Design a protein. Structure first.
Lengths: 375, 76
């Protein structure tokens, strides 16, 4: 069928461990989340311990909602793991945001492989605990996780130019250009001639062997050079999520499963909200509403987003491109009912029917009670 | 003289430094400009890592030349 059905089946098929503590404890410091998270997680031999409820504490902070802190960790660690400065991952192309494995990871850090297994474990923990990583990989990355082949067309979404350059060779006789089975790459103020095959420097690309040339260039760009890195990642990820189980998703569903944003930007949420039946940005009640949303924690904000939209996952690009059951339906707050009534929501229209409460405190209790009722 | 330090994100930095400066110094100069603790910096010139002790002229680094910055993973 569709995605929402698979996901339930998925979470359901995820075996809970009964030979493990009821929590996985982490004492971290934001200034060193990477090395702190790395040592703690890579310290445990049995990945099964990572299935336990995440109990994370930043800088000694205590009493905070576990889920809210976990959500922050997945955001903070993502920003570090996926920081190109470390040479583990890199941006797919100029002015592109998607992340790809840096083929030269071993030259930036000798410990890259274990860090790849680490990122894999974190990615796995994200999926297992129903959280998300902040960042998006190139499509071939997801395909490799599903163990799908990487063909020419896969190149288009990643390197439009390269794809076209190969398209030309595929549609023309390149013989006279005297191309050889090699490829140049510049790396740290140097150039490197790479053999696509044995004696590639000699073999000339013709009409009869250009098909083989294409295929090889694809593998060298996406698969071959990053072989050991992707394996380390998949080893870590599959320690939490069964490889066979995740095969039910395609590259697009898989991306949705593990990538996206956890909490919402209130300033963006606000700026793209529409008001009905007398309310406006400056209406006292609305000012109270946004003040309320402002002093809710991560967990509460999401529970509100879910109470009004039905879903708890934020649409990328912001609320400017929010969608309702039928067509783009902006987030709407409309005056309705009397202060005696609890707020009501129409998920289809992303609309909150908000009575004209007479104080901030009252608006807080009423709104919170309505949200808690449908829980 | 003027040298550059390209990062793995494509950002190019520009430093004002003397040929006598040690690699410890450039890492320091980089710290002030990009706010990065020098003990986390790896400098690459012509495919070679640069050691804190030696100077720029020890690696035959001259003006307009380009060094490469990589953040250090502490592994272990």
């Amino acid at each position: 069928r569709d995605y929402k059905r698979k996901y339930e089946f998925f979470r359901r098929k995820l075996k809970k461990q009964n030979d493990i503590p009821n929590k996985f404890e982490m004492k971290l410091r934001r200034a060193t989340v990477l090395e702190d998270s790395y040592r703690r997680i890579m310290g445990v031999k049995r990945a099964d311990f990572l299935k336990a409820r995440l109990w994370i504490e930043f800088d000694g902070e205590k009493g905070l909602d576990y889920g809210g802190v976990a959500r922050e960790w997945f955001f903070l660690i993502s920003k570090e793991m996926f920081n190109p400065y470390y040479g583990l991952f890199e941006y797919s192309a100029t002015d592109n945001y998607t992340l790809q494995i840096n083929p030269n990871s071993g030259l930036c850090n000798e410990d890259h492989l274990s860090y790849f297994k680490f990122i894999g474990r974190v990615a796995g923990m994200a999926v297992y605990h129903g959280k998300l990583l902040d960042g998006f990989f190139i499509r071939p990355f997801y395909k490799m996780m599903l163990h799908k082949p990487i063909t020419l067309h896969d190149m288009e979404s990643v390197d439009s130019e390269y794809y076209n350059s190969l398209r030309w060779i595929l549609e023309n006789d390149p013989t006279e250009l005297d191309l050889r089975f090699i490829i140049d790459e510049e790396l740290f103020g140097q150039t490197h001639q790479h053999e696509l095959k044995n004696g590639g420097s000699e073999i000339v690309v013709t009409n009869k062997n250009k098909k083989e040339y294409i295929y090889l260039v694809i593998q060298w760009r996406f698969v071959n050079r990053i072989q050991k890195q992707m394996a380390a990642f998949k080893e870590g990820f599959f320690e939490l999520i069964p490889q066979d189980l995740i095969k039910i998703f395609d590259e697009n569903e898989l991306e949705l499963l593990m990538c996206g944003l956890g909490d919402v930007d209130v300033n963006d949420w606000r700026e793209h909200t529409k008001y009905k039946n007398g309310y406006s940005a400056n209406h006292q009640v609305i000012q109270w509403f946004w003040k309320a949303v402002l002093m809710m924690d991560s967990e509460k904000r999401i529970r509100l987003l879910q109470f009004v939209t039905g879903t708890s996952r934020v649409p990328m690009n912001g609320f400017a491109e929010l969608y309702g059951s039928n067509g783009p339906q902006s987030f709407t707050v409309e005056q309705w009912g009397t202060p005696e009534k609890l707020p009501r929501a129409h998920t289809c229209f992303n609309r909150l029917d908000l009575p004209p409460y007479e104080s901030f405190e009252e608006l807080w209790d009423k709104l919170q009670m309505a949200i808690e009722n449908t829980q | 003289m003027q040298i550059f330090v390209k990062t793995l994100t494509g950002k190019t930095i520009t430093l004002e430094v003397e040929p006598s400066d040690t690699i410890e110094n450039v890492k320091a100069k980089i710290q002030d400009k990009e706010g990065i603790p020098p003990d986390q910096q790896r400098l690459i010139f012509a495919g070679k890592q640069l050691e804190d002790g030696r100077t720029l002229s020890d690696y035959n680094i001259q003006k307009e030349s380009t060094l490469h910055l990589v953040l250090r993973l502490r592994g272990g």
